């Protein structure tokens, strides 16, 4: 009841003749809260965090694809807009539907499974095919791992190093970033996925982390194999509805980000000085080395 209160207020306070009728937390992330407000509109919310620039990069984003993009498909339209390092809020009218999961996919018939399929390649090629905020992840990456020997690889394991610099390796011998680069939506999953009535997508929410990237960078949750994601048969046939890209290659994209996620969370809880992070994701290398 408390956080309602405070973010009533600024609300109130940033955006003048706004008035809070009804206000509540529906969703969050870990530096992040979104509020349904008046039943209407989505507040997202972040105060003083690693990225300073955020939100106005997302911003930027919905008001690009707000122009550029011809479909159906619903996104955020943004509203209201107050940026600042302490503090940052987007407000949009809520896109209204029901997440996709693995459970309502699995209900749906075989047509409507396709249609959605269709939905998406469909969204991902137009996105894709915009002439267009970049992000390079082998570099991005490359600079995480330097952070890590700056701060406390020499206190990690042998088991832990090793997976580092197994993976390490691999990211220098791989090709899979010397594809098409495209502007994608970078954190496409079934839980930003909003379908209609008939089991249609009708919006896609969070371009949070959109940008300029490799094209197969969408395709990696698609692909996924977990309790949260469809699993890897969907991913595929939307790969081969999309089109002129090559399915392995997606897949090994797919996989070395998954290899990178324990170290991924590690550098999180360096930078954010979160010591949970860092616990978990050395837990995690560990639980991964004796999977057989
Ligand atoms: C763009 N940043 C993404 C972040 O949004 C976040 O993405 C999540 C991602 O973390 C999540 O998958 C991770 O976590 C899954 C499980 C532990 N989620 C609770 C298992 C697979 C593992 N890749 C996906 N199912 C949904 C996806 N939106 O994690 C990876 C990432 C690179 O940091
Ligand atoms: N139905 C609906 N839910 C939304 C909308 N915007 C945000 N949400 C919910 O609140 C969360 C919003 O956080 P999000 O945009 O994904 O930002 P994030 O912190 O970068 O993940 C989502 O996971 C949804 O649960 C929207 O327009 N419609
Ligand atoms: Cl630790
Ligand atoms: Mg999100």
Do not use: W
């Not at 911003?59 to 209201?80: D, G, H, M, R, S």
């Not at 503090?87 to 075989?110: A, N, Q």
């Not at 399929?117 to 330097?146: P, W």
């Amino acid at each position: 009841a408390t956080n309602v209160k405070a973010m009533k207020y600024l609300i109130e306070h940033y955006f003048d003749n706004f008035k809070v009728d009804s206000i509540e937390i529906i969703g969050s992330g870990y530096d992040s809260v979104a509020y349904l407000v008046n039943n209407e509109y989505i507040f997202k919310t972040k105060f003083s965090t690693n990225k300073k620039k955020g939100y106005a990069k997302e911003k930027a984003i919905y008001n690009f694809l707000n122009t550029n993009l011809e479909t159906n498909v619903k996104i955020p339209n943004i509203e209201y807009s107050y940026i600042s390092d302490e503090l940052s809020i987007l407000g949009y009218k809520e896109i209204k539907g029901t997440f996709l999961t693995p459970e309502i996919y699995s209900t749906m018939s075989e047509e409507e499974q396709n249609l959605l399929k269709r939905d998406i390649a469909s969204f991902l090629r137009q996105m894709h095919g915009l002439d267009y905020c970049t992000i390079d992840n082998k570099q991005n990456v490359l600079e995480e791992y330097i952070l890590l020997r700056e701060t406390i690889y020499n206190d990690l394991t042998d088991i832990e190093k090793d997976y580092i610099e197994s993976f390490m390796e691999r990211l220098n011998a791989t090709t899979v970033f010397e594809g098409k680069k495209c502007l994608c939506h970078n954190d496409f999953s079934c839980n930003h996925l909003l379908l209609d009535g008939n089991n249609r997508l009708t919006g896609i929410i969070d371009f949070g982390d959109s940008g300029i990237i490799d094209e197969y960078c969408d395709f990696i949750y698609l692909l996924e194999d977990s309790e949260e994601e469809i699993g890897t048969n969907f991913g595929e046939d939307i790969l081969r509805m999309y089109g002129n890209i090559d399915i392995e290659k997606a897949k090994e994209y797919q996989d070395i980000v998954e290899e990178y996620y324990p170290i991924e969370t590690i550098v999180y809880g360096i930078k954010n000085i979160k010591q949970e992070f860092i616990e978990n994701g050395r837990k995690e290398i560990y639980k991964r080395t004796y999977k057989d």
